[PDB]
Amino acid sequence: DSQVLGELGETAVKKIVLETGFIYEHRGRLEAGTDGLIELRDPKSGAPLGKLLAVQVKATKESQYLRETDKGFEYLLRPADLKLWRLSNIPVIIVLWRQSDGSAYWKDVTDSVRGEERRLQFDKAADVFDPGCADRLGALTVDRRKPGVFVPPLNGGETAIINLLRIKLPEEIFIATSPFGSGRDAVPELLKHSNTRFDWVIRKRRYVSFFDPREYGTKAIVDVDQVEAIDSDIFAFNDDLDDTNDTMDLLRRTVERQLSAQVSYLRKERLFYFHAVATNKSRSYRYLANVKETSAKVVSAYTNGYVRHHAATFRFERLADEWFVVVDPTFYFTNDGFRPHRYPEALLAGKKRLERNAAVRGQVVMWQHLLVESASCNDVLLDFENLPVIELSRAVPESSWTRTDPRAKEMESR
Amino acid sequence: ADLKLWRLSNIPVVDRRKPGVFVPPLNGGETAIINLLRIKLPEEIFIATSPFGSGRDAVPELLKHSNTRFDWVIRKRRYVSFFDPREYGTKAIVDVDQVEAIDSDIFAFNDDLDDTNDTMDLLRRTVERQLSAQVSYLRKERLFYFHAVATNKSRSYRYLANVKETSAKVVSAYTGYVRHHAATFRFERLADEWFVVVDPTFYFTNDGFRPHRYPEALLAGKKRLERNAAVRGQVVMWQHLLVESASVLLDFENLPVIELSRAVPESSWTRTDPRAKEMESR
Amino acid sequence: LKSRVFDEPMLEFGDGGQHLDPRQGLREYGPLQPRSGDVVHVGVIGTEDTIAGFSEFLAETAAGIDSDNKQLINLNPDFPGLGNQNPFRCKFVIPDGATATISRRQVTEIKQIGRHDEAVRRAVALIADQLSALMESSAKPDVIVLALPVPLIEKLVNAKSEEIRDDTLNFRDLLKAKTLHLDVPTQIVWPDTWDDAAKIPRKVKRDSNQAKATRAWNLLNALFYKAGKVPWRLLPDQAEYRTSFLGIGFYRDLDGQQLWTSTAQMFDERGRGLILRGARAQTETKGRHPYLTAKDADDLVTQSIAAYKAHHKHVPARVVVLKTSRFRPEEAEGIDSALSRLGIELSDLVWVQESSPIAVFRDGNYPILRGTFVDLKGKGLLYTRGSVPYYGTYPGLRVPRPLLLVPHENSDSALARLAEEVLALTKVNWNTTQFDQKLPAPIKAAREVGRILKHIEYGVAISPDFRKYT
Amino acid sequence: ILKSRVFDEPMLEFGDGGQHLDPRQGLREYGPLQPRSGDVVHVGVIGTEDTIAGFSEFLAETAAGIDSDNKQLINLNPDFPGLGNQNPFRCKFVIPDGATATISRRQVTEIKQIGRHDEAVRRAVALIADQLSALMESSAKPDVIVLALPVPLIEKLVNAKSRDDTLNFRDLLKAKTLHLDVPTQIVWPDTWDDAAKIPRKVKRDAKATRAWNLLNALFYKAGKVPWRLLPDQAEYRTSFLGIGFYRDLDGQQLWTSTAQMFDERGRGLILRGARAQTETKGRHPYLTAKDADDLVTQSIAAYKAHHKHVPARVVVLKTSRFRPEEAEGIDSALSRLGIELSDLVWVQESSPIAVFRDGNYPILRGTFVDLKGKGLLYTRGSVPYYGTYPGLRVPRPLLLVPHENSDSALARLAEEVLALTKVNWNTTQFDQKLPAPIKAAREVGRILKHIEYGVAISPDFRKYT
């Protein structure tokens, strides 16, 4: 009810503002009205001029203001509403609108933005808000290029996505001792058998995996009589440094196998990267950004030369008895799609220099899509869960900035 | 003098299976080959300062220009190369008014640590380019290896052993891995001469180009069965590749065979040793 | 996940004047505590050209410099000059006989040395002598500007490509260490643009371009800070001299056994820093992950509070300790022992992660607002860099990456209060007048003094004045 | 023009001036160097009732003699002639009464069931250190104590492979029992050969050779001298001083210098010096001239206290190059002591330089090649006295780089290094790769890293073996 009524008052005020020779820009909502900006308009070209006046509309249906007669009335100001302009150094006017009579009254309230003058005095004769106020409002505007003046962020806020995906572990994890001290020592024994797989950890003679080691070739590298299935809640959520470190290690190797159709792992660089399928040939990955499908050239060959692969760093972090995977996008460069380039650092700095927000955000969405997608039907031990969006209390005025910031193009992802 | 030949023999002058008796090895010597090749440096070497501290920092500026090459060294703001940097794209990564052609022996044969290390570094990068037709260089593995030419396809290198022509499957295809003849190169200074040392090994990929997963374990399988005649042959082959390449800034000379005063009684041991078959390369 | 967008931290500028922007606040109110007749005496070392060039730029600075483009007037302000609208309310004067000239031959001699380490050592020895001669009662300079010729700086400073250690000596780091016993702060400037030099890698070629007004702001603010004057004060609402912020860091020696040494960087709300050197550190693995024992952490905190008491004559009521590595149980124990002994009942231990991969992303081309704070179940994601409403843009090009703040369980304060203070501590600036800096001052000073103290032998007493390390 | 040499297999002196190249054949013919009437080595045993009785039966079968199972290579696989009239050690090997400690089968299963490897090792060490202590309190006072842990317990404590991350059972056992002042010998209970020294096989697969090696090791640990190196002259004594380093795990991970001082009778003295400096980022340990002076001075003093004479020649062996400070400090100590003969030899184990003969058998052991100031020495290779190459993988030579302060010529030093490879406390096969002082540096460093710096340590090397 408050919302609709506010859009009614804003629409009435917006209609007058356009007749008066100004541009109206909506900014946010208020208790009973709206928050907006007024800008002077070139009468012929319609172009913005750069002179600003903040406007707050308060609307009411058929209600009488304080101590109202036929000659004037009084009004009590809302400090939280005026506080959105506390440091902007932009002048503010309030415009009171009523649905019964259709009356619009306005008053300059900059002095109440920085003080405690809450009692307003209105004179229905001189305080009328209508197209005849062009000269009065124009004299109240401030230049956008006056030192200390800035447009504040939007009070309605916006959403944002995090680079964290919740991991859902299986209920059981397999404990064992091993003849080998580390997995590095156990691999040559494992390769001597068949039915092999590498999503397991052996550190300090202890073995961990989400699959049963006795049902695969891993039986040759474990003490079979000491294999034991425990509740994965106890292993993955305790205070023991050895256990949390081995959980992070097992989570990574499990992820490595689960995503092996699309990406491979680089041990030295600690990087997951979309591998090539043919030398000197590009390929794309199809994922869902928002409600629309989109393609990213995860392997991009530049014919002779080098081949650029979409890469990412995975960190597994525990937050309040839950495990999460963090995705940090980057790139990896080969000479032909497989052979590593002998000077990759130079190429990474080249692509990273031009990276902007939209591109980085899109890579996070794509990598998070690849993680969640591998749990459904593409052997699958980990499920991944998207987090709710973050509700930020203040939003970047991008729409305003794309007009006014001379560097708005430098922010675009080429 | 006297019965010197039978000094340690403990054979009267007994059963061979009596402890302590040892058939004296037939006197007279045999020859042998060292895994070393003398390196003849060019007359001149080019030194200069650089705005970049290291060669890694200089590469992005080098790529911005044309006529590039990578057989150069920049360390501690000092550039060295056997070619003139002013006549190639390396002009962008040197202070051109500091470029100075000096005698190679001054730089390569002195007591300075940085000069000796930069000489070793330049020799390795000059060799890598001079051998780029047949072998590539691995940065992590620090290996020179015969690169694969076609996916999952073998090839052979054609060299000379003794005075007889021979060949070897430097890239071997089994059509779940492929093994490449590899080697570690070491550059050692003996008196006032530089030598390259050749130490053969192998390198394992998947299809010829994709690195194999855990090739360390595939290596130990082939190294386990490697015996003298195999290692000696690989030394001879790599030594031929290096001498052949100067047919270019570096030349390589073969060293004389070493004359050993005593000889392994191999002919006798093949009959008497129950492990002689364990000594051959399968 | 709880999210807040903090207001830009307010600053007090004098006569009670309050503003979020250091530049605009100085223009409108002046500095915090000016005295009638304030003057910064500036010595100059350089060649005849660079000395005369610096005198020219100081004159245009005094006359006032207009902005190149007033579309982003807050990010690209005018400089109102050093007259009636002097934002520092202070004279900047080169006294008579306060200039030492470097001969044309001395410049060429260094440019021609083939080994970089020897060229740096020769340059440091040359400038240290000219510095010492200037301080032999010739004048009493409060700060000395080093205007080295462009080819000399290019000889001494390594180059990195436009896109983009200890293998080579760092001229700036060795110079600051070799001249620390002389009690002068120095300012190395490029003699063409008059901005900071030798602190970051240079480009292969110097651009001919301008933003002279901004460079004037940054130069005078650096000379102002180096002279010891306070431009403004942080946390205006909070009672002053109550809370102090004690950064604890480590640097690794190069010779000997490459032992680590603990350092302390304690700042007040007036932006003044005290630098103290503690005991050698333990290490967790193979000489890495430096840490302090409880006795050594106790000693370092106690030595710090004592230096705070010698300069401010009273003891702080709260001490916020900042580290870039997690607090060892020994460190938390030693800090508590030292503070309880001195009767300091309020303390917060904050682990500030510079390189956390966790990030949040808005929909659009502009990045997250600076001051955005996301509570990640006891871990604070804080955006000290990002979109700045006051500037009307995002002043960077590469995307920002947030800090991750992990307060110790021994802390008294809530996570959101500590994050807001960390945000405020990013405003203490000795190098620029642009307030959107990533690190809080105690952590920034740790890296800067570590690069200098590793050239001063362990055991040698060092000056506690941070302004002489900048 | 590369000068070449093939050294004779260095000769050893046995009892009554008897001479032979083979320690086994020499003891068979002449007996040990300095035998006495009634010579006995008292052997204590720690293990289970099964393994204690099993070891007592292997000692008895050893005393009765064991025959070779490959008489076509008789010198490499000799018989053991027994402990009777043909006793090569001319000494008795006897387990005294009450010199046995039993580990209960409940104590075995407790350690075998410990989850963490590091906790099972520390508990097993503390248990054996208790049994070790008790036997010593008993008036038996054995000379060497054999540790016969059952096969499942060794397999628990020893990693398989078909080092600082996990505790090493053997290293921590030697460190924690070093103060008890008795050498120990860990053995497998089925084959009675050395255990826990190297990684075991994941699945356990000549008896006379194992008898030879077991007795030679107990003989050495008891302190008796089997033979001595035959010096190339008869005027003065030479001492071989190995200088090494080991790194601490706690604290600041500082390095500590060690000294391994061996005489021509094969006996070593172990000293700890000052903390080492490092070159880059805590790596490449080295000593200052002052600390190298002190270390060599402390080693000479210990040698004098045990021998009542100062050697006329000191050979210093290192696995890393001699820093100028190290060479300066070594010269200062020796000159102060009036020692006028010295050699500083850098021994490189991993050089890629090699020499290749034409055939399937590798280069002869003892082959030396002068590489213009650097000595290529094949300490392993074809052994004529064995009639074969005792190995399978091709051998790789040592590279000897004498410092310029050395007094000897290159060829003479290489033959000396070849002879030092025969001082050997773990086997009776003489074709060892490393000379004894360098071999001791590795073993000694793995043990002392578990003993806090500044704690007095025993000087007798037999207690570290």
Ligand SMILES: [Cl-]
């Ligand atoms: Cl695919």
Ligand SMILES: [Cl-]
């Ligand atoms: Cl390079």
Ligand SMILES: [Cl-]
């Ligand atoms: Cl290097």
Ligand SMILES: [Cl-]
């Ligand atoms: Cl001059």
Ligand SMILES: [Cl-]
């Ligand atoms: Cl000879």
Ligand SMILES: [Cl-]
């Ligand atoms: Cl004598």
Ligand SMILES: [Cl-]
């Ligand atoms: Cl070998």
